[PDB]
Amino acid sequence: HGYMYIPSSRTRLGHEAGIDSCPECAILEPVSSWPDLDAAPVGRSGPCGYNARDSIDYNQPTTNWGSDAVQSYSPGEEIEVQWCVDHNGDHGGMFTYRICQDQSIVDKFLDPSYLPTNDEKQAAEDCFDAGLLPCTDVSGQECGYSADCTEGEACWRNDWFTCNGFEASDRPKCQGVDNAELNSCYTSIAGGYTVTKKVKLPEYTSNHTLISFKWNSFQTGQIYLSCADIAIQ
Ligand SMILES: *[C@@H]1O[C@H](CO)[C@@H](O)[C@H](O)[C@H]1NC(C)=O
Ligand SMILES: [Zn+2]
Ligand SMILES: [Zn+2]
Ligand SMILES: [Zn+2]
């Protein structure tokens, strides 16, 4: 279970506003999450996530998220991106961050008076997939392959990030990436650990667009999606 932490995602804001009791519980399931990381339809989850237990659709702004950019950046800037993983239930896998460079598509996710349909969520997801921010765009960042993949499979791609191996004796799983302290970021279930990387923002301007986080599991069929409202100026 996890969600995007920095920049602050809609999910983070929904928990901090007192609405979402389990920000890490916004899950896309049942799906095939592995090895073809992009084949499963996103359904109601969309690029921003849907939290089933409080019926919270993060693809639509409310007074508590989505009105405005939470943070402003420059085109091409290399930025910190962090997600928070709950200790109970971290089983590794692969994750990524994406920016859709089609403002008219994104705009349907920025309107508090409009709820994107599942078809619109999927077209947006496709735009996000085209706008994936590769690990390898950041000079000096080490971008390895998953210990849960073999060459020839659709998971063998180092544009996505990988968690550490599940089976490692030292620093396994997603928690092992940073080896941070317990409750270094909030989760509701058992306490949270940061998972930190860098991405290079596209050379693109917007006063209000989205960065969408996606995390795919290998051992079970599940995907976690979040999105953050940002500006690139
Ligand atoms: C952002 O809005 C300001 C007006 O408040 C405008 O001058 C500027 O060009 C806009 N930037 C983008 C990227 O559209
Ligand atoms: Zn695919
Ligand atoms: Zn607006
Ligand atoms: Zn357009």
Swiss-Prot record:
Localization per record: Membrane
Positions of post-translational Methylhistidine modification: H1
CC cofactor: Cu(2+)
The protein's name in its UniProt record: Inactive AA13 family lytic polysaccharide monooxygenase
Annotated disulfide bonds: C22-C25, C48-C227, C84-C185, C100-C127, C135-C143, C149-C155, C163-C174
Cofactor note: Binds 1 copper ion per subunit.
Keywords: Copper, Disulfide bond, Glycoprotein, Membrane, Metal-binding, Methylation, Transmembrane, Transmembrane helix
One of the record's GO cellular component terms: membrane
Top-level taxon in the UniProt lineage: Eukaryota
Domain Chitin-binding type-4, residue spans: 1-230
UniProt-annotated binding residues for Cu(2+): H1, H91, Y224
Chain positions carrying an annotated carbohydrate: N207
Keyword Transmembrane helix (UniProt): yes
Lipid bilayer topology: Single-pass membrane protein
Name of the gene: AA13
Protein family (similarity comment): Belongs to the polysaccharide monooxygenase AA13 family.
